[PDB]
Design a protein around this ligand. Structure first.
Ligand SMILES: O=P([O-])(O)O[C@H]1O[C@H](COP(=O)(O)O)[C@@H](O)[C@H](O)[C@H]1O
Lengths: 561, 561
């Protein structure tokens, strides 16, 4: 094929955040050279001499525009001298799988076509996320580099006639005009490399007995029409032995079936209705690219993501990987409940409180200091890859159920009776105007930082709350030395309870206030009650010191989790 | 997994024939330790110090018993010290694919569970074919050493508890007692490695234009329910774009649908009748393990296997592989017609007449002296692997058709006019009485050695046949040094015509007299007339000169090919 040089006109808004470049599908399709300029910038950060012996892993969640985005990446990678492209079959490749294949075949990096839980289709979103050699997402130093080139780009090289058949497995070789070495495209089976990794981390024999035996565990997995569908079928139904009716919605639809692939009780309300009937012992829901999960137990019993990282850490050695590799350390994001801390302190293992964002967990994994990590936003993982893994959290839960012979409910009741219950809730204030939310945060910060606020007592019913610590979260990363200031206002009470405020939506007229309430309760009689009824006294106090209603006009949150 | 040693009793009839151990399924499942002893004998030929770093490839055509036998190969190969086994998914792997994979991954050899053109099922045939490092079948020195061990084996080693699942792709590792290194079973896709090899041999673009473009060559490919099924759908249908309706009987059945998987005019009768409708331009059928093929043109136009090698050799440069590799030499088996010979002599390329049974061609291929070869038993191939390849011959005919743009009947009319027509037909005289057959052969042998025989003139209807050479065919292989004598009575005439006698019998049921007629014709008009009438003179002369019906009682040929 021939290598053509196209003279282009640069764009100012192609700034890749740590989730890559997420935009509307109509933007990439209408803006001439939009996807082509960004794809060319990604390969331009790769040294020209490093390209011929370099491999790029490409894959996506199967949403609308993904097939044409992969075909564009092939034409540009070839014309730029990239030696080999490992593409998943039909372009399908889950985010945890892209991280597994990059580390397995020593790839220089990978391009993941996905907007995560963000909707797909002609009127949905589309994103291009770049991962580097360690399998993790590209860091700021690299995303800034891609941004500088995407806005100064005068030209881009492309092979217009190069057309690869994405549905056929195997190697495809293309000869480029007058070029001595051939361009190679390797189409891999979407699930195989990822399933071989899990087969070593877990005990697929104890699990086969658990899922398909006579006295077996009856599960129900909702893949939400996203990229984790084929992975549930091939691993949980085919190899582990669970009946095909266990894996529900396991077929990737380009529009996710007009639904949002996000693991939460309202977006995954169908699973919640299937679990109330009492027919199944374990239920689980996933996201677009399969790197997050929602664990449900019998009769609808919701397992909070913060309590889930504490259950796996309390039963970590029932998983073969950890028994052989050892637990190098535990970690959680600052807003995540204190349930993990109880376990890490009793087990005498290192605990790390990091700011929101997977990169902080990656830095500690690459430095051999982090084994298990959790986020309150449905996220659990481990140093097996450099991204979050929804299906790994589910097989880790099924491993604990098989080792203990107990129900999801009895394992958590047992956990709260040993460490105590960290009642957790997150209040989301969605389309809030910037000036009222920013002023609210500055006032609360000036109030907290008063020389007498530490020691102050708040009371909203029976128990009283004494403030022992009050600060605006600041983290110094021990690996790259970075200093992440202004990460969240924390009111830490002497009984272990916390109230956290986070302004997520910052640089925009529509700001988003995230309010996290964490109430610790060692009282064995109070541990089995409704979290909103026990958290009411501490929520009322958060609303009073923040003057939230007064600064935002909000008498109620948009979403409660 | 445990390693136990089973004491056994040896068998006198476990003799590996030229194409492996072909035998009725009844002997394999009824006789205790039958398959176990032969599999252990094959693995015993592997020097102990070389077993850990040795890989064996395993796969079969999918017939009855193939799955239980593969589970026996895994346990015995693991307990014997073999470090790695590469098996096709579900155990399904065609003979040409097994040869491709062995040569590609540098395997020590491979064990193919297939009885080829023999039928399968509870009351059918079974067979364990052993191939060596070069990808081809095990030579006499190796098959005979396996026979010497099976004849005297006193015990075998086995891991009873080991049970791998052929359905799941990927790497599976198992730990054996007192073994520092783990056992590896690598399940590979049945078509991938094989499709990549054909993708570098033929131009898949021109072929996609031929089968899916405006003209659309309406083909019909019958897989006879054997192993080539998945290979036809994945390569000819999905990749090259041929409408699913073209792939008839492409699903591997353990009983082959209650029929012989043999591509000849008697067993592949359905496909011929469907071709005689006039709708399709090209038709083809394959056998059990997939190394054979039957070529049909519009209206049922049968392309004789001996002429088919000559066509591919006359237009051999239409295929990219031979353009870049060149032609080291042509070869055929002695019984096969002289059509290829007429083509070989029209060029500066060597020609080899070899004894029937593919193993002879391999020796010429390893010494880089053979590029294209074929046998009148519907077998065609090339140095690209060390086995025959029916799907290769089909894509080679589709390559010739895309270059020529003519119909299968016109390509052969042009061929028969340029080199003349070598009329060929196969008269198999089934089960005759031993004394009458040996005497007929001895009588005609002495008659062919009469001092006044060469130069004598035969005459029947229109052609006068003068004897130029008359001998009893014997072979000296240039690589192994062996001398195979009395292979067949060759009555040769100076015009280019020939008659062949191959008395293949047994000290059991009876003796078969294989009559091959090779009537060469060079007249522009007579060549387009029916083979049965045009061959008539040489057929009567063979009967009158050998006194056939006279010493055998056979007035009509039992088999006709
Ligand atoms: O045994 P014979 O003498 O009748 O030999 C016949 O069958 C053998 C097995 O065929 P395959 O390689 O397809 O399994 C062939 O190689 C040989 O060409 C043919 O003459």
């Amino acid at each position: 094929v021939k290598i053509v040089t196209v003279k282009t006109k640069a764009y100012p808004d192609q700034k890749p955040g740590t989730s890559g470049l997420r935009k509307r599908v109509k933007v990439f399709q209408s803006s001439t050279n939009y996807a082509e300029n960004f794809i060319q910038s990604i390969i331009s950060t790769v040294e020209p001499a490093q390209r011929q012996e370099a491999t790029l892993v490409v894959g996506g969640d199967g949403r609308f525009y993904m097939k044409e985005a992969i075909q564009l990446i092939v034409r540009i990678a070839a014309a730029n001298g990239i030696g080999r492209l490992v593409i998943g079959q039909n372009g399908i490749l889950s985010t945890p799988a892209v991280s597994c294949i990059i580390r397995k075949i020593k790839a220089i990096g990978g391009i993941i076509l996905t907007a995560s839980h963000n909707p797909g289709g002609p009127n949905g979103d589309f994103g291009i996320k770049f991962n580097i050699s360690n399998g993790g997402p590209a860091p700021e130093a690299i995303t800034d580099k891609i941004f500088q080139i995407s806005k100064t780009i005068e030209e881009y090289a492309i092979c217009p006639d190069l057309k690869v058949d994405l549905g056929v497995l195997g190697k495809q070789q293309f000869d480029l005009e007058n070029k001595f070495k051939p361009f190679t495209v390797e189409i891999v089976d979407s699930v195989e490399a990822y399933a071989t990794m899990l087969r070593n981390i877990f005990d697929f024999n104890a699990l086969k007995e658990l899922l398909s035996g006579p006295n077996r565990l009856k599960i129900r997995i909702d893949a939400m029409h996203g990229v984790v569908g084929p992975y549930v079928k091939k691993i949980l139904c085919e190899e582990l032995g669970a009946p095909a009716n266990s894996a529900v919605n396991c077929v990737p639809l380009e529009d996710f079936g007009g639904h949002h692939p996000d693991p939460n009780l309202t977006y995954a309300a169908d699973l919640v209705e299937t679990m109330k009937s009492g027919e199944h012992d374990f239920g689980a829901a996933f996201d677009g690219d399969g790197d997050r999960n929602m664990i449900l137990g019998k009769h609808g019993f919701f397992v909070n993501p913060s309590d889930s990282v504490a259950v796996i850490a309390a039963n970590i050695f029932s998983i073969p990987y950890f028994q052989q590799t050892g637990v190098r350390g535990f970690a959680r994001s600052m807003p995540t409940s204190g349930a993990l801390d109880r376990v890490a302190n009793a087990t005498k293992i290192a605990l790390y409180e990091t700011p929101t964002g997977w990169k902080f967990f990656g830095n500690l994994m690459d430095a051999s200091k982090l084994s298990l990590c959790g986020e309150e936003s449905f996220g659990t993982g481990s140093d097996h890859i450099r991204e979050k893994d929804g299906l790994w959290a589910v097989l880790a839960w099924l491993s604990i159920l098989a080792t203990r012979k107990q129900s999801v409910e009895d394992i958590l009741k047992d956990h709260w009776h040993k460490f105590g219950r960290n009642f957790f809730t997150r209040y989301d204030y969605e389309e809030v105007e910037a000036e009222g939310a920013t002023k609210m945060m500055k006032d609360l910060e000036a109030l907290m930082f008063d020389r007498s606020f530490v020691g102050k007592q708040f009371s909203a019913n029976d128990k009283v709350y004494t403030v022992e610590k009050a600060d605006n979260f600041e983290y110094h990363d021990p690996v790259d030395g970075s200093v992440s200031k202004n990460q969240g206002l924390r009111l830490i009470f002497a009984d272990g309870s916390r109230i956290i405020f986070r302004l997520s939506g910052t640089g925009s007229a529509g700001a988003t206030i995230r309010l996290y309430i964490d109430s610790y309760e060692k009282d064995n009689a109070k541990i089995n009650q409704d979290p909103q009824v026990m958290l009411a006294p501490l929520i009322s106090i958060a609303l009073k010191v923040s003057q939230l209603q007064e600064r935002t006009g909000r008498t109620a949150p948009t979403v409660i989790t």
